[PDB]
Ligand binder design. Sequence first.
Ligand SMILES: [Zn+2]
Ligand SMILES: [Zn+2]
Length: 220
Amino acid sequence: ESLPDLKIEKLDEGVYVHTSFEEVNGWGVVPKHGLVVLVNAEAYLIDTPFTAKDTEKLVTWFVERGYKIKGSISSHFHSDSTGGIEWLNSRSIPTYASELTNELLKKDGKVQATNSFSGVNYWLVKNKIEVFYPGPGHTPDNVVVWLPERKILFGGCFIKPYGLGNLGDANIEAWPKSAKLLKSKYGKAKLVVPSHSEVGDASLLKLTLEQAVKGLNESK
Ligand SMILES: [Zn+2]
Ligand SMILES: [Zn+2]
């Protein structure tokens, strides 16, 4: 009835932070950040909004300012990251997903991305966008997206300094190990964009690490 409208804010050179909302069973509504990275005249969707409406608005807002949407990539199989894939597929816009996240969607009777990748890393665009997989954590497929020439890290729902959040499809045992490996590879971070918290810096990495180890202990 009353849910904030899609917000698109500029983050750096060609990087935009997009936020959509959705009523789940928390203290009500919960915001979710994603990103549009502009390479040249080509935009890329790092995670999509929860719905087609928000995904349709986001796309056109960029197409309006003369940018062709080259594709999207989802961080994990959940909805704050895969909802708008459907809309995108019908408009036949290249959609990407990890082979584990596309398997998980399938499992849930959800439409699948039209492009898969595997391995510890994938260059969506060779020297500008890397997708890294530190290992099971928030969910078992969650990936992280790295912006080389800007030191920005999109860590979606994996990065959660203040609270682990939805433990639904977690791997509490391994989150600490992945959280540790992630702090190592990309500690060279300028910015770190969580899915449900204010933008940060290398510190959100150490925070989620303690947050995760505590979660592991706090269960045994
Ligand atoms: Zn999630
Ligand atoms: Zn989430």
